[PDB]
Structure formats: C-alpha cells, structure tokens
Amino acid sequence: KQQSTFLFHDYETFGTHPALDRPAQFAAIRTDSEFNVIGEPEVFYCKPADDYLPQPGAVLITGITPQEARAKGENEAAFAARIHSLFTVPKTCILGYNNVRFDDEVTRNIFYRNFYDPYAWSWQHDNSRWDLLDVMRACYALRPEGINWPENDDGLPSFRLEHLTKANGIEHSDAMADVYATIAMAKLVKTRQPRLFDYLFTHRNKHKLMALIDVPQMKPLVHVSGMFGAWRGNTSWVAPLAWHPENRNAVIMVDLAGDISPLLELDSDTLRERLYTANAAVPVKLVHINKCPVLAQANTLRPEDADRLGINRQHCLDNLKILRENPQVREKVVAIFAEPSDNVDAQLYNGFFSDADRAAMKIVLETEPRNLPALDITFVDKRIEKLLFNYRARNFPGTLDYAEQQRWLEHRRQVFTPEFLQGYADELQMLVQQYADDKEKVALLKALWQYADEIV
Ligand SMILES: CC(C)(C)C1=NN(c2nc3ccc(Cl)cc3s2)C(=O)C1
Ligand SMILES: [Mg+2]
Numbered sequence: 001k002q003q004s005t006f007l008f009h010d011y012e013t014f015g016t017h018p019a020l021d022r023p024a025q026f027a028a029i030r031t032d033s034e035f036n037v038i039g040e041p042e043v044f045y046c047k048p049a050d051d052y053l054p055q056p057g058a059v060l061i062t063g064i065t066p067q068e069a070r071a072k073g074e075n076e077a078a079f080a081a082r083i084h085s086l087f088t089v090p091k092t093c094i095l096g097y098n099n100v101r102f103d104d105e106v107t108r109n110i111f112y113r114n115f116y117d118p119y120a121w122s123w124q125h126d127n128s129r130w131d132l133l134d135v136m137r138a139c140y141a142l143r144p145e146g147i148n149w150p151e152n153d154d155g156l157p158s159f160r161l162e163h164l165t166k167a168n169g170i171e172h173s174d175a176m177a178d179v180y181a182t183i184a185m186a187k188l189v190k191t192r193q194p195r196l197f198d199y200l201f202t203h204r205n206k207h208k209l210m211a212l213i214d215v216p217q218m219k220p221l222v223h224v225s226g227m228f229g230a231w232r233g234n235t236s237w238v239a240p241l242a243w244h245p246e247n248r249n250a251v252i253m254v255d256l257a258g259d260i261s262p263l264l265e266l267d268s269d270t271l272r273e274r275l276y277t278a279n280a281a282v283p284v285k286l287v288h289i290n291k292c293p294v295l296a297q298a299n300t301l302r303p304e305d306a307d308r309l310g311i312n313r314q315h316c317l318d319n320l321k322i323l324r325e326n327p328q329v330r331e332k333v334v335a336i337f338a339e340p341s342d343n344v345d346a347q348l349y350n351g352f353f354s355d356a357d358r359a360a361m362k363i364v365l366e367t368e369p370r371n372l373p374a375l376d377i378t379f380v381d382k383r384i385e386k387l388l389f390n391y392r393a394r395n396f397p398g399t400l401d402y403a404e405q406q407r408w409l410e411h412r413r414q415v416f417t418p419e420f421l422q423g424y425a426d427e428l429q430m431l432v433q434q435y436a437d438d439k440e441k442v443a444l445l446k447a448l449w450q451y452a453d454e455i456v
Contacts, residue, residue, distance in 0.1 A: 002091045002126075005038060006031045006186075009086075009096050010178045011106050012062040014054035014069075018105035019345055021055060022048045022076070024064045026083055027179050030092075035187050043175045044082060045073030049394035050455055051412050056427055056448055060435070065447040066455075075395040080114035083107065090125035093204075097161050097182045100131040100291050101226075112348045114391060115365040117358065130204045131292055132185045133159060138200060138224045138294045139189050141235040141309060142301065146192035156230040161185070199296070206249070206289045212297065213251055215240045218324050220256065220316070222301040224294035227285060228255070233309040237298055237316040238287070239323060242330045245338045250286045252333050254323060256316035258283025264326055268335035275336065284333055344386035357381050364388065369396040416456055424452055 009028035015021025028042045047070050048054070054066050073079065087094055087107070096103050108118040122129050136159050140149050150167035152158040161181050165172035170184045190197045202208055212221055218239040228234045237256040244250035254260065259280040262271060275282045287293045306313045323329060341347065353361065360377050361384065367375055372392060379385060393400055393408045400408060428449050435441040 004033045004091045004093070005089070006033070006035065006093045006095060007086060007089070008179050008182050008186075009094065009099070009103065010182070011103050012064055012175075013058060013106060014048065014052070014064075014066070015058045016055065018102060019109045019348060020343070021058070022046065022052055023079065023106055023110060024048075024054075024062060024069045024073075025175060026079065027175050028086060029176065029179055029183075030086075030089075031183065035183055035190070037183075041176050041179075042082075042086060044079065045069045046079040047073035047075050049076070051394065051408075051415050053416075053424060053452055053455065054448065056431055056445065059444050059448060060431070060441055063440075063444065065444060066451045067447060076110065077114045077391070077395040080110045080116055084111065084116050084121065087121040088125065088127070091127070092125075093128045093130055094122065095130040095132065095182075097178065097185065098131065098133045100129070100134075104129065109345075109348055113345065113387065114395075115361045115387075118348065128204055129292065130201065132182055132189075134224060134226070134292065134294050135189055135197070135200050136164060136185060137226065137234045139193055139196060141224050141233040142222075142296075142305065143193045143196045147188060152230075157233065158230075200294065203295070204292045209289050209293065209295055212295050213240050215242060215251075218320065220298040220320055222296045222298060223253070223287065225285075225287075232257075232311060235301065235309055236311065237301070237313075237320075238285075239320055240287075241284075241323070242334045244286060245334050247286075247288075247337075249290045250288050252337065253285050253287050254319075254329075254333075255283040255285060256319045256323075257311060258319070260319050260322060260329075263329050263332065264322070268332050271332065272336045272339075284336065286337075344383050344390065347383050350383065351381070353381055353384075357384060360384075364391075369399055372396075373399065373401070421452070421456070425449075428452075 007028055007030050009026065011023050011027075012025040013021055013023050023046045025043065025045050029040075030038045032038055045064075045068070048066055059065060104122075107121075111118040111121070121127065139147060140157055140159075148167040150158045150163040152160070152163070158164070161178060162172055164170075164185060165181050168188060170181065170188070172181045213219070218241065220237050220239050222235065223238045224235050226234055228236050238253040239256055240251050240253055242252050244252055254263070260283060262274070262280050262282050263284070271282050271284075275284065287295070301311075303313055357380055360379055363377055364372070364375070369392070372388075389404070389407070393404065393411070397408070428445050432442055432445050435445070
C-alpha cells in the first residue's frame with residue numbers, strides 16, 4: 001500500500017526567532033526506511049514581505065541575502081503550501097537535526113500565518129516526527145563506543161553537525177549539505193549502535209514513552225536532554241511527580257542529581273520565582289511527551305556509565321528515597337505550573353482553534369486571493385482577522401484597497417521606527433569592522449545595507 005518513509009529537512013532562516021524572524025530557504029529529501037534516497041532533492045526559497053529586515057548574524061551564517069530570497073522565492077503562502085504537501089504524505093517520519101526545538105517551531109508558525117493547521121501534519125496519516133540531535137546526545141551518553149566524539153573549544157562534547165561529520169570522516173559542504181549530513185548521522189548510529197537506534201526510534205511514540213511514566217511510584221528514569229548540559233553528557237536520572245495542570249502533554253519531573261531542599265522547604269510562589277529567572281536552583285523540569293524526549297528505565301545507565309559522565313548515582317538514589325517519603329511535593333510542583341504581546345505573529349500558543357474556526361480557515365485557504373475581500377465568513381478567535389489582514393497584505397498586496405494600503409503603510413511605519421533603523425545601521429557598521437578581513441562577509445553586510453535602504 002503506502003511505504004514508510006523519512007523526510008529529512010532543514011530550514012535556513014533570517015533569524016533566531018521561529019515566529020518573529022522569517023524563513024529564507026527549505027531543503028528536504030525523502031528516504032526509505034533504510035535511509036536510501038527516494039526521489040529528488042526539494043530546495044526552495046521564501047520571499048520575505050516588505051515589513052521585515054533580517055538579522056545580520058543570520059545572513060552571515062547562511063550566506064542567503066534578502067535580495068536572493070526575494071528574487072528566487074515564492075511568497076510565504078506558496079512556500080507553506082509546498083512544505084505542507086511534503087509533510088502530509090502518509091506514513092512519513094518528518095525529521096531533522098534540532099528540528100524539535102527549532103525547525104518544527106518554524107513550520108508551526110509558517111502554517112499558523114498561512115491558514116494551515118499547525119499540528120495535524122505530524123500525526124495524521126500515520127505520520128510522526130524525530131530529531132537526530134538527541135539521538136546523538138543519547139549515543140554519547142549511553143553507548144559511545146564506535147563513534148568519535150568531538151570537543152568544542154571550551155573542552156566539552158560538541159553535537160554540532162559540522163563537528164560530528166568532520167570527527168567521523170563524513171563529507172560535509174550546497175543547499176542540501178545539512179540534510180545529507182543528517183542522513184549520515186542516522187546511518188552512523190544505526191550501524192554502530194543498532195539496538196539503541198531501534199530503541200530510540202520506537203520510543204519517538206508518545207504511548208511508548210507514557211508506558212515508562214509511573215507517577216504514583218515516582219519511578220526513576222534516565223533522561224538525556226540538552227537542558228542538562230554537555231558537562232554531564234546531557235544526562236541525569238529523573239522522577240515524575242505530577243502531570244502539568246494545563247498542558248496535557250507535559251509531565252513534571254525532578255532532576256534527582258539536584259538539590260531537593262527547596263522543594264521540601266519553600267512554598268510554590270517562591271519556587272515559581274526562582275524557576276523563571278534561572279539560592280539553590282529548583283531541580284524541576286517539564287518533559288514534553290510529543291517532543292521525542294529521550295527516556296529509558298533507570299538501569300539503562302549503569303554505574304560505570306554514571307562514573308564516566310560524572311553523575312553521582314547514590315545521591316540520585318538518596319534523593320529518590322526522600323521524595324517518595326514526601327508526597328506533598330507533588331501538589332507543590334503542580335501549583336508552580338498552575339500559575340503581553342499584541343503582535344499576532346507572536347500568538348501561536350494563545351490557544352487551539354475550534355473545529356468551527358479550523359473549518360472557516362480551510363475555506364480561506366481554498367478561496368482565490370482576489371475573492372477573499374468578498375468572502376462572507378465569520379471567526380470566533382480574535383487572532384484570525386489579524387492573521388487574515390497580514391496574510392493578504394504580505395502575500396497578495398495587489399488585492400488591498402486604498403484603506404487597507406494605508407493600514408499596511410502604518411504597520412510598516414511602526415516596524416521601521418527611526419530607533420530601529422538606527423540600531424540596524426549601527427549593527428551593520430559594527431559587523432563590517434569586526435569582519436573587515438572576511439571579504440565575503442563584508443559583501444553580505446553591504447547587501448543588507450542596500451536592502452534596508454530600499455525597504456526602509
Ligand atoms: C544493578 C543494575 C542492573 C545496574 C541496576 N541499576 N539500577 C538502578 N540504578 C539506578 C540509579 C538511579 C536511580 Cl534514581 C535508580 C536506579 S535503579 C537497578 O534497579 C538495577
Ligand atoms: Mg538546521
């Protein structure tokens with residue numbers, strides 16, 4: 001019938017914020033279940049709308065100027081359509097390298113802005129997602145033998161894709177370079193740690209993860225997470241205390257390697273304050289069951305593994321005993337999580353849309369742009385009419401009437417304040433001095449100046 005496939009992908013963007021910065025380029029290729037390429041590379045650009053200037057640092061990294069994306073790209077509506085078409089092919093595992101924390105948020109935001117369901121793509125038609133970054137971290141932590149693990153310039157293990165490829169003799173340039181490097185990482189771990197690879201892949205599924213969670217017993221688990229830090233191989237033992245009171249997919253864990261005294265001694269208001277500035281640190285963290293967290297039974301990390309990572313196993317066991325004897329900590333941590341921006345681009349997580357609103361937004365999607373002004377349609381959620389105006393003005397500006405044109409002009413004036421444009425110019429001048437010896441970067445910075453001069 002339909003074959004299971006992987007769709008490896010990567011974005012280049014114009015900045016670090018997945019909602020407020022705009023995408024520049026999307027790259028993807030599909031493989032079979034054994035990581036052999038199927039079909040052709042998909043690479044395309046996104047034209048940025050005229051209400052945005054790129055972050056100069058992002059352009060220095062990607063080498064993609066706003067002029068290039070504008071001249072070679074389609075509008076974000078069309079960009080979104082192409083990506084949505086790829087991501088909704090049945091039985092696809094959509095994956096990348098740091099996609100769970102970055103690329104997937106870019107995707108959610110692109111879909112949100114352009115009237116696609118931000119979530120359905122990842123689970124409908126037997127689809128799933130995965131991320132090779134925490135696979136590499138898990139391999140280093142749990143089963144490192146066979147792979148060369150590079151250090152960064154601070155002397156800690158690095159999981160930068162370019163460091164891992166070089167360290168392991170993998171060729172890594174080409175818009176497809178990061179995608180091909182990600183495929184190489186997948187092959188590396190599958191070949192060299194086959195049982196761990198299979199375990200991690202199987203446990204991408206929320207139900208397999210949920211089966212590991214035993215809140216009444218505070219059953220300990222090994223967890224590998226970038227939040228723990230490279231200095232301990234991104235690893236600790238954790239115990240589940242309670243599920244999040246609002247977020248259906250988040251469990252509240254305690255880091256057993258931490259100091260649990262604040263949890264025993266302080267009240268939830270105090271605990272909440274410390275947790276959100278980031279004097280002992282509050283050893284609580286959320287694990288999101290749909291974000292392919294790395295979790296395994298506690299004995300997966302053996303004493304000799306803990307020793308290698310510098311983790312104090314007996315301290316963790318001691319803390320687990322104390323927590324089990326203090327079940328009032330559960331209500332405390334729940335109370336912590338029981339508990340600003342007027343830019344609709346920043347409002348993806350203000351709430352889920354109702355079925356009625358989703359049905360209305362589908363009509364918007366399936367209507368010709370020229371016919372949108374006459375569309376007799378109503379929305380409940382207050383984000384949607386704002387999303388719709390921006391959608392039309394950014395993508396289909398020739399369909400705006402005089403009044404709408406004036407509204408868009410005002411929008412642009414509020415973005416391009418004299419203080420914003422001055423700071424932008426100042427940043428460019430600073431970077432040209434910093435990179436004066438790198439003539440290609442100097443050329444990129446000059447391109448950014450020229451674009452700002454035009455778009456203003
Ligand atoms: C002896 C062997 C197999 C390594 C085991 N280690 N182990 C556990 N190690 C830890 C380490 C930390 C914690 Cl919090 C719980 C456990 S349970 C077992 O239950 C059995
Ligand atoms: Mg990337």
